[PDB]
Amino acid sequence: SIVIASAARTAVGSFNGAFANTPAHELGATVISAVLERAGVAAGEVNEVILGQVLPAGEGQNPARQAAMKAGVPQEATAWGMNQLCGSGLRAVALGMQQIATGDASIIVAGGMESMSMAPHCAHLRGGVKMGDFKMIDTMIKDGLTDAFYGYHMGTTAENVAKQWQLSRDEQDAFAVASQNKAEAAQKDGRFKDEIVPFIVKGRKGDITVDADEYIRHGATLDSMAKLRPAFDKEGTVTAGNASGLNDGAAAALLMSEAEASRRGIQPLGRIVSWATVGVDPKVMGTGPIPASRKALERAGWKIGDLDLVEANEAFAAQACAVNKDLGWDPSIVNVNGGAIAIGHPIGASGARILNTLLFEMKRRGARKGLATLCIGGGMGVAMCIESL
Amino acid sequence: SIVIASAARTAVGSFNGAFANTPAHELGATVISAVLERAGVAAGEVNEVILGQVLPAGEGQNPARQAAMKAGVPQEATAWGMNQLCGSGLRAVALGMQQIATGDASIIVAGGMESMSMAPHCAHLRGGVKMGDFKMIDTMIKDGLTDAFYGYHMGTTAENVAKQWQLSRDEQDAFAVASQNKAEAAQKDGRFKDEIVPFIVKGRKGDITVDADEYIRHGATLDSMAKLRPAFDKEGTVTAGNASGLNDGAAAALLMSEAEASRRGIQPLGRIVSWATVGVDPKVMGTGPIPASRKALERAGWKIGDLDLVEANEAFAAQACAVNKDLGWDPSIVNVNGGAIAIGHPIGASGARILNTLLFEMKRRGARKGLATLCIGGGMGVAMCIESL
Amino acid sequence: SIVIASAARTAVGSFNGAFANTPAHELGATVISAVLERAGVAAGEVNEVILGQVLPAGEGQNPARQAAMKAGVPQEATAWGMNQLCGSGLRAVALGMQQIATGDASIIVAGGMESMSMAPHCAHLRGGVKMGDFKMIDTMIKDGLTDAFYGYHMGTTAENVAKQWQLSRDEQDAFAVASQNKAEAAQKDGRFKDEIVPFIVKGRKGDITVDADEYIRHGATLDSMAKLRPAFDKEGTVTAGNASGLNDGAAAALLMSEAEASRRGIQPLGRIVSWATVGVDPKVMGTGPIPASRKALERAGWKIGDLDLVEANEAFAAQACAVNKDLGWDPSIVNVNGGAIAIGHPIGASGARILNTLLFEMKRRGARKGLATLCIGGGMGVAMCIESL
Amino acid sequence: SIVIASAARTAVGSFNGAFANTPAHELGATVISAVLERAGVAAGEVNEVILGQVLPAGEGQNPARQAAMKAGVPQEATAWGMNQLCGSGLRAVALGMQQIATGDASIIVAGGMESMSMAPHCAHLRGGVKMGDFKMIDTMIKDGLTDAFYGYHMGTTAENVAKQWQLSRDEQDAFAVASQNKAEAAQKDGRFKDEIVPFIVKGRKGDITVDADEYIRHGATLDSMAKLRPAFDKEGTVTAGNASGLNDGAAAALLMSEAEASRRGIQPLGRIVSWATVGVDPKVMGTGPIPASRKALERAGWKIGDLDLVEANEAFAAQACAVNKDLGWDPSIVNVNGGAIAIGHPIGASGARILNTLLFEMKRRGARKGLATLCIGGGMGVAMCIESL
Ligand SMILES: CC(C)(COP(=O)(O)OP(=O)(O)OC[C@H]1O[C@@H](n2cnc3c(N)ncnc32)[C@H](O)[C@@H]1OP(=O)(O)O)[C@@H](O)C(=O)NCCC(=O)NCCS
Ligand SMILES: CC(C)(COP(=O)(O)OP(=O)(O)OC[C@H]1O[C@@H](n2cnc3c(N)ncnc32)[C@H](O)[C@@H]1OP(=O)(O)O)[C@@H](O)C(=O)NCCC(=O)NCCS
Ligand SMILES: CC(C)(COP(=O)(O)OP(=O)(O)OC[C@H]1O[C@@H](n2cnc3c(N)ncnc32)[C@H](O)[C@@H]1OP(=O)(O)O)[C@@H](O)C(=O)NCCC(=O)NCCS
Ligand SMILES: CC(C)(COP(=O)(O)OP(=O)(O)OC[C@H]1O[C@@H](n2cnc3c(N)ncnc32)[C@H](O)[C@@H]1OP(=O)(O)O)[C@@H](O)C(=O)NCCC(=O)NCCS
Questions:
Q1: For residue A340, how far is its CA from the centre of ligand 1 (angstroms)?
Q2: Which residue's CA lies nearest to atom 22 of ligand 4?
Q3: Rounded to a whole number, what is the distance in Å from the CA of C238 to chain B's nearest CA?
């Protein structure tokens, strides 16, 4: 019944890098337009825009709506943002599918968007500070990467999972290197080109078109990897090298009923067969995808074995290993072109980013059944099953 | 099909008043447990918590999850925040309804929370400021009350509607006084008591139980109203007395299929017959409710005259009069117990706040059909039709 | 040789009290004009204005010149601030006297000024914060009250003194309550009137004339002093009751040669007979007045027993008790009208504020020889000897 | 009677340059140690350290003492900062001289220090900001470079001087470029080595020794200077090319009586014969060196024509040309090694920076009579005459 007509994501920017001063909605605008052009659908025909975005402090009222207008979706349409942290990008798409499934909408653009670079520092100062220093809080750290119940960073959560699953430093380092190697391979081979819509960084002293994921590291070594110090646990195992990065970007999908696509001449990228969200203990939030993936499969009537391709977000090597290990899916069909450790992890947009990767990879290799999953801070997982047409 | 088993809202506090240092997720927690308690449903049976909240900057990862966990909802359920500005609160209920309608969940707690008081000041400072002064931005104003397209305040958008609908000062002032008198009248007769769930302001030198809307003004006079100066247009017509306030508050609804409610021996507050969202010109966003209400009515198969009760959000006197003027519904059945001008307007929670009043008034006066509607910044409207059982 | 022709001070304001929003140079301006007027000296005759000031951040270019200009001092004269912390206001008078002694000026207005209440919060942001929270530093605490060598407050230096000299809590509390009772008695008998020049806080909704020290507590009790908790060492002895306060004010003197006072028929408040400044260990900075007063007396050719009156600043009861114990001067001739624990401590102005208190009490009771001394953060003392004529 | 036994300065850093994160007091300690070492004078013989500094906000209690303590000056000595804006570095040396002249000290270290790069942004937040955006004030701009009476930059006072003296854009650029070429040539020839003491910028990933004035531009061209846009008056004449820069550095002199230097066998850098400080109209502050230099010469009993070398600070080429036009001294003996447009202008230290330049050049060419003079914000000048021994 509901299909993904088309899809597009911007390249993934490094932190304070290519998109350093670009407001997320800008990145979103371009993705909204791309999905529209790629399916031959006019912005005028868009009923609603849903955009997962975790850190919009100071970007003004509802960046989703600013993105939609910037891209030309008429003012008669609607737009909103939502936040299930890292599952935000994928959850948006589910939510948008529900919009058409309940008959409240016909065509929706959904995904996520995030400028981690542009997230401001803040302080509650209405009462006034009579005396003494006060903290200016980094909303990126506090609102997107800190567990709100234990007060520690996501990396600590990953350390909890490493210990629990007995995942050594070498084994998390081995996984990251492979991730970099696969992503680099993919990039050289033109594998990210279909899904990427080039973004124009509007300059003054010149415009700069970005069309390549700049965080991927070329020639990543195991030696350099092994020399890094633990980033969260002083005598820990998680490093800057075996953990995803801080990044900016946007990604989305054009959804509509299979019938509608059919009436249009559009050849969909896939049919949303099912999706699932489930909670877990915040301390081991990286285990989130296990239950969520299984739930989604259950709802689709699929067996783990039925999958031809998987995209399981790499928040941290230790959680990614745990997930694969538990689920037992064939490593070889997971993150075929690299994962977040290489490509980057723009919080609110990462679920839509990985959906794009999955979707263009299923088309190119002809795979039939695919699944995208992500772990979520606070103890949750989100998964989506897709079947090609 | 989908019914609101129960509901509850906190009292609405004034700006920097009783809830001044209360983070929105603490009020959220209170309301979520009330709804459970009220329906006789254990925390453990909740599948998901959906909370609209426009100003979470500084509160930490996904405040919706923090509310859930604090209220006893196990780590297995899931939670997420969403923003559709003042439409958030109501929109969330519709989204939860859809969670059930598509068989993705059985029981959902939905509504909104907001702490305007706790909204921080911010500035983007990763790039550094090499030389010169910079502005510390009030996130409540930028991210909550400032049009992102014209850069002006919602107040000005109200002025645009005033001029366009030729709504004099005296006319808006009249409207304001009435909502105060009506909000004061209802508070005096205990009309808000079923909906309110007392909130314990955890103190040090004393704990304070808040159970009354502190923002309503007793004995509002027209003379005092007419002596106030325009707050947005220097030679304008909108003032602080005929505009909504800056407030704190949380409100939520417990949703489940009608059959499920019957399986549990619950007497529902009503069934959600339809809902709708439509966009309009951002300049006159106050008109929001006209197109959305009509749509909602159309989808429910109801006529304007079928409505027994109506709750149409009092963002500004100007917009409220324009809404009622155009729709034509009998004034006496609209905001019978006062509106946001007197009660308050905790942006992300308001849509669920006005559903609570609609819901408990419909039960108390035995009205069968009702409609809640709000105007949304950026030019949008949200509407929902509820029928008692 | 060099005399003090006249002097004046403003009443000392409470933290965030009467002068909460009054920049220091405005207080300074009134005291430069009272001094001129009190001596029969016109502003066109001033050569230079010298003002101690420790916390001028955010006030603009050289506030000493802003105060001199506001008082009508001609643009041909010059002005400069200096900073020897609490010894500033007194040390300015000694540097003004040297301007004259070396023949480079004939008429100087010297003293201090401080708005502790207007000191801002700051942060070094030129390089930017790539990520993580940063502190907004309270310039009053950082630049005015925190030792830069040990990182702790001036109050801890007082705890070091309390321990080393074995001053109990009881004795420190007895000292602070005699301070209060003495200042209150002098206030009620009109003893502060000659020295206070009234300050007009320019309002909008009314101008307020402040001519009374508002920090002096009336009816201070030993019981209330004794129940206060230690302010700096959780199991310390220094409290808010037995410590000076954070205050605002300005004070000054008009200086010229004795021969010049004599050509003008002026009856000077005193002859500056000597002064001195010496360092001590920062950890016990509060003992500064010992060596500085001993040095000043030696330079004057005076024994301690020759003094008729003393003003030794009350930064903290502990340190004032140690100075008194060590020096051995008759306690009934020291701070006869109360001192800083009751009157307050506007850091850069205090040295001139206690010099005003000495001069007007020496003229009142006919005391021939006096001495004013103050302890200084970072381990220093300053002291000056005055003889009447 | 009072001689400068030795002197030293650090190289001048570019804004956010080599000493971007080096607090002034660390630069000042290196110069205090250098004057001592240069004269055969041990740190335990020092009575007082006097350091002009206009921007100490956020550095902690009295940076002059911090500098002194860091250099090994005993805690029994004293230290203070003072501020007469750009004349501060030179005024401190006259101020040190007066301490010996009056018998209150035997050995003084005086000069100035400044980290314009380390100057913070601030806001008065004690009273609280109920709502709205507020300004984070650049203290270097506000407290160091803006006139307090007219509210405009020091550069607009340079435009006023330009119009009034009818100094064209061409004349200003030609002086600027001659400044750069003369400093490049003295740099390359090694004439700045004697005066400069190398500064070790403590690294983490390497210590860096800074011993060269980095602001100096090599190969400055008239053409690129001519193409610059006006920086303060949109259709003005003062540009970033013909104005001084924003810089970092420290500079000092070690003083003692002539008799004392003779007892020690010290061959002093010169005898302080007179100094003067005079005010002028704040709007044409750049003219202050005129009256101050004539006054200093008159106190020395010298004619302008008796001078063999002059250092006249280059706040802006417009005022520098005005000063040279009025005084009429031979331009060939003024700033023979370039000035502040090329070397840089660390406000609090500049006075001493140009006095080291003057002294070391008088020693190398055998110049007997010299003068150092600087213009001061707020309408003032300072100047000092020096005679070789
Ligand atoms: C791990 C983390 C704290 C690193 O932050 P950081 O210390 O500022 O990171 P950096 O990139 O500066 O790491 C330091 C260095 O490691 C190097 N490095 C990183 N990956 C590397 C690799 N594969 N090989 C070699 N060097 C590598 C960087 O290049 C850098 O070099 P430098 O110090 O010379 O500049 C951060 O990326 C983070 O919080 N990431 C996301 C975690 C997260 O919770 N995401 C949400 C999902 S739950
Ligand atoms: C109108 C608005 C700008 C007022 O802000 P403010 O100036 O800080 O408000 P205040 O409460 O201080 O108003 C000042 C005065 O109005 C007075 N006032 C308010 N309502 C009054 C009434 N009905 N009768 C008499 N006086 C009244 C207050 O008592 C106060 O008197 P005071 O000077 O002694 O305090 C603000 O409420 C606002 O932006 N509101 C929200 C509107 C909005 O855009 N909502 C989003 C939905 S689209
Ligand atoms: C001591 C100090 C830290 C107190 O700061 P604070 O805690 O914010 O001060 P407060 O004024 O709130 O004192 C706390 C309370 O003690 C009470 N108090 C103070 N003196 C009292 C007395 N004599 N009797 C009874 N109560 C008294 C105050 O009224 C207040 O009551 P509250 O809590 O009901 O408001 C501060 O004044 C200080 O740092 N002072 C000295 C500064 C210094 O070093 N200056 C330079 C010297 S080198
Ligand atoms: C004039 C002033 C505002 C310039 O600040 P800014 O605009 O940020 O300055 P910059 O140094 O970045 O701008 C100079 C620009 O012209 C260039 N420039 C400067 N001097 C040049 C020269 N001599 N030849 C060629 N180009 C030159 C700079 O390289 C820069 O080019 P860029 O932006 O491509 O990198 C600032 O240096 C100043 O306020 N100086 C004041 C000194 C003062 O008032 N001190 C107290 C004195 S009373």
A1: 12
A2: D241
A3: 24
Half-sphere exposure of A380 (CA within 13 A, CB side): 32
Residue pointed to by tokens 């005024």: D91
D245 and D303 co-located in one domain: no
Both D287 and D169 in one domain: the answer is yes
Residue finishing a domain among C272, C305, C328: C272
Residues C370 and C300 in one domain: yes
Quick one: closest CA in B to C127, which residue? B128
Q: Which structural domain range is residue C249 located in?
A: 1-121+191-272
Q: Among residues C272, C290, C317, which one ends one of the domains?
A: C272
Q: Which of C1, C65, C7 is nearest to C269 (CA)?
A: C7
Give the torsion through C-alpha atoms of C122, C128, C133, C137, to 10 deg: -10
> How far is the alpha carbon of D127 from chain B, nearest alpha carbon, in Å?
15
* Whether C255 contacts C5, CB under 8 Å: yes
Q: Which of C136, C145, C232 to probe the A interface (max A CBs under 10 A)? A: C136
- Say if residue D197 is in the same domain as residue D94: yes
Asked if the C-beta of D130 comes within 8 angstroms of chain A's C-beta atoms, the answer is: yes
Can you tell me the distance from the alpha carbon of B75 to that of A281, in angstroms, rounded to the nearest whole number?
Answer: 6
Alpha carbons B229 and D257: distance in angstroms, whole number? 71
Same domain, C108 and C253: yes
Dihedral (CA of B188, B190, B196, B201) sign: positive
Question: Do the strands D248-257 and D369-376 form a parallel or antiparallel pair, or are they unpaired?
Answer: unpaired
- Which-ligand-closest: CA of B55? 2
Q: Cα angle at B251 between B246 and B255, to 5 degrees?
A: 155
B226 phi, psi to nearest 5 deg: -75, -10
CATH no. for residue A323?
3.40.47.10
What is the distance between the alpha carbons of residues D374 and D245, in angstroms, rounded to a whole number? 15
Backbone torsions φ then ψ of B387, nearest 5 degrees: -125, 135
- The coordinates were experimentally obtained by X-ray
Contacts of D128 in chain A (CB under 8 A): 125-129
Give the position, in ligand 4's atom list, of the atom nearest the Cα of D232.
3
What distance in Å separates residue D123's CA from the closest CA in chain C? 5
Resolution of this entry in Å? Answer: 1.9
**C129/A121 CB distance under 8 A:** yes
Three-state DSSP class for residue D381: strand
Neighbours of B325 (CB within 10 A): 12
The packing angle between helices D24-39 and D63-70, to 10°, is 50
Distances (CA, A) of D345 to B189, B246, D114, D247: 74, 49, 9, 5
**Whether C324 contacts C334, CB under 8 Å:** yes
Q: Which two tokens stand for residue A295?
A: 């739930």
In order of B35, B221, B332, the CA distances from B364 in angstroms are 18, 29, 16
Asked if B264 and B244 sit in the same domain, the reply is yes
Q: Is residue C376 lining ligand 3, measured as CB closer than 6 Å?
A: no
D94 and D116, same domain (yes or no): yes
